[PDB]
Design a binder for this molecule. Structure first.
Ligand SMILES: [Mn+2]
Ligand SMILES: [Mn+2]
Ligand SMILES: [Mn+2]
Ligand SMILES: [Mn+2]
Ligand code: NA
Ligand code: NA
Ligand code: NA
Length: 320
DNA sequence: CGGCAGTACTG
DNA sequence: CAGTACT
DNA sequence: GCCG
C-alpha cells in the first residue's frame, strides 16, 4: 500500500461512521480506502485524487489536507462515544442500534453490560466469548475444524461433501472463523442432516454454543480438545447439489467481491445469489426485483464468471 | 435524485 | 417488522 | 462518502 499515511486516517473516520449507524457514508469511505490501497504510487494531486474510481471531490480534499499538513482535522471532532460504541458492537449479536441504546442508557464498559444490560441469548454468548471472537486462528487450526465437521458428517453418509470456504479457501494465513459448506452429489441426501450432525458434534464436546439454528444455516461456537485451545466461531451451510457452485462462490467471498459481482449482474438484467444466477430479471425504477427471471445452469464457479462475461478468478484473487 | 447485494434467522 | 448476521 |  503506497498510501498508508492516507488510508490509516480515513479508516478512523470510516469506523466512526460505521459504529454510529451511518452505513452508506461508511461504505463510501470503505470503497475509497480499498481504491487507495490498490493504487501503485502515492497520490500526489487533488487532480490525481479524482483520478481514481471511488474518490470524489470531498475525498480528494481530505487526502490533500493529509499530504499538505500530515493531518485531518475532522479526526479531532469524532464523538467521545465512538470507542464505547465500538466496544459494545464487538459483542456478537449487538450492532449499531443496540450499542447506541446501551450508550444512551448510561453504559460505558463491558462490566456495565454484564451487570446491568438486558442481553439476548445470542449477545450473552457473544459477551462470554468477547476476547476469543476478536482473535483470528492460524489456518492450520481452521483445517482441524473443517476435518472435525467432515468426519462427523461422513459418519452418516460417506457421500457428503464438506469444504471450508471464506478466508480459508481464499488462502489467508489466519481465519476469523471457519465457514463449512455441505452438500451431497445425489441431490437428495443433504436433507434433514442438521439434526444428527449437530448432535454428533455436540455429544463430542466440540460444539459449545449455538447462535443460529436454521433449516439451512448454522452459526455457533466450537473448541478443539486439549490444552491451549480457544473457542472459535463456526458457520455451516447445507445446500442442494444444484446450487453448489453459487453457494461455493457466495461462501468463499470476499464480501466486497460478492457485492461487486452481484452489482455487475444487476447491470446486465441478471441476479446473483447463493442459490442461483438468474437472467431476464424484472426490476422497478428503484432496482428492486419484481419479476423472478429464469435460473441459469451453473455447474461450476467458472460458469458463473462466463455467464457474466468475466474472466475466471481463483479464490485467492477474490480477496477484495 | 437516489441506489449503494442478496439472502437467512430471531423475537 | 427491525435488527443483526453471513460472504 | 461515490457515482450514474
Ligand atoms: Mn469466515
Ligand atoms: Mn462465517
Ligand atoms: Mn475460550
Ligand atoms: Mn466476515
Ligand atoms: Na474517481
Ligand atoms: Na456485534
Ligand atoms: Na446504573
Amino acid at each position: 500500500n503506497h498510501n498508508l499515511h492516507i488510508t490509516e486516517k480515513l479508516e478512523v473516520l470510516a469506523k466512526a461512521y460505521s459504529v454510529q449507524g451511518d452505513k452508506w457514508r461508511a461504505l463510501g469511505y470503505a470503497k475509497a480506502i480499498n481504491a487507495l490501497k490498490s493504487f501503485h504510487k502515492p497520490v500526489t494531486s487533488y487532480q490525481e485524487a479524482c483520478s481514481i474510481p471511488g474518490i470524489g471531490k470531498r475525498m480528494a480534499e481530505k487526502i490533500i489536507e493529509i499530504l499538505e499538513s500530515g493531518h485531518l482535522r475532522k479526526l479531532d471532532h469524532i464523538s467521545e462515544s465512538v470507542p464505547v460504541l465500538e466496544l459494545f458492537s464487538n459483542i456478537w449479536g449487538a450492532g449499531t442500534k443496540t450499542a447506541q441504546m446501551w450508550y444512551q442508557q448510561g453504559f460505558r464498559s463491558l462490566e456495565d453490560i454484564r451487570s446491568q444490560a438486558s442481553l439476548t441469548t445470542q449477545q450473552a454468548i457473544g459477551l462470554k466469548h468477547y476476547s476469543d471472537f476478536l482473535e483470528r486462528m492460524p489456518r492450520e487450526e481452521a483445517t482441524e475444524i473443517e476435518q472435525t465437521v467432515q468426519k462427523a458428517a461422513q459418519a452418516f453418509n460417506s457421500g457428503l461433501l464438506c469444504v471450508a470456504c471464506g478466508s480459508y479457501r481464499r488462502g489467508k494465513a489466519t481465519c476469523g472463523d471457519v465457514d463449512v459448506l455441505i452438500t451431497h452429489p445425489d441431490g437428495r441426501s443433504h436433507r434433514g442432516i442438521f439434526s444428527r450432525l449437530l448432535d454428533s458434534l455436540r455429544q463430542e464436546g466440540f460444539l459449545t454454543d449455538d447462535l443460529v439454528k436454521g433449516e439451512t444455516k448454522y452459526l455457533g461456537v466450537c473448541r478443539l480438545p486439549g490444552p491451549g485451545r480457544r473457542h472459535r466461531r463456526l458457520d455451516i451451510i447445507v445446500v442442494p447439489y444444484s446450487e453448489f457452485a453459487c453457494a461455493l462462490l457466495y461462501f468463499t467471498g470476499s464480501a466486497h467481491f460478492n457485492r461487486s459481482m452481484r452489482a455487475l449482474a444487476k447491470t446486465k438484467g441478471m441476479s446473483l445469489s447463493e442459490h442461483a444466477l438468474s437472467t431476464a430479471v424484472v426490476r422497478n425504477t428503484h432496482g428492486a426485483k419484481v419479476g423472478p427471471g429464469r435460473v441459469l445452469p451453473t455447474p461450476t464457479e467458472k460458469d458463473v464468471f462466463r455467464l457474466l462475461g468475466l474472466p475466471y478468478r481463483e479464490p485467492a484473487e477474490r480477496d477484495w
